[PDB]
Amino acid sequence: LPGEGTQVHPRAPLLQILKVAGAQEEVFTVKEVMHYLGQYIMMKQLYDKQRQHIVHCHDDPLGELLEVGSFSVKNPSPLYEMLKRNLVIL
Amino acid sequence: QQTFXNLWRLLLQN
């Protein structure tokens, strides 16, 4: 995963999720990708209402990319693995 | 009692 300055281009399935969250560009930093992923999860209320570090991704397009039904914001490895599969480094 | 927005921001900014 590249640093705070390196630019990335998301593959089409990930870009569609970012665009739902309001992204207007096609090139990002990793921290911008994470911003829009957070926006997406928040807008769609995928986080568990009571234990809000748990994200329930099943039956959502995000879960199809993550390949897991749920994950913890404190165990972000599935998210990082998804980003490695879905970001082209520029 | 931490909100998702605060938890994700911590992840994002680290």
CB contact under 8 A, B5 and A73: no
Breaks in chain A after residues (C–N exceeding 2.5 Å)? none
Residue A43 has which token pair?
């807008």
> What experiment produced this structure?
X-ray
Does the beta carbon of B14 lie under 8 angstroms from any beta carbon of chain A? no
CB contact under 8 A, A73 and B11: yes
CB contact under 8 A, B12 and A47: no
Burial A26-62 (b: 16+ CB within 10 A, else e): eebebebbbbbbbbbbbebebbeeeebbbbbbeebeb
Q: What domains appear along chain A, each with residue ranges and CATH number?
A: 1-90 (1.10.245.10)
Judged on CB neighbours under 10 Å (0-12, 13-18, 19+), A70 is middle
The answer to whether A67 and A78 have CB atoms below 8 angstroms apart is yes
Phi first, then psi: what are they for B5, rounded to 5°?
-55, -40
Does the beta carbon of B3 lie under 8 angstroms from any beta carbon of chain A? yes
Of A31, A42, A74, the CB nearest to B5: A42
The three-point CA angle A45-A46-A49 to 5° equals 70
CB contact under 8 A, B7 and A73: yes
Resolution of this model in Å is 1.6
Rounded CA-CA distance A25/B13 in Å is 21
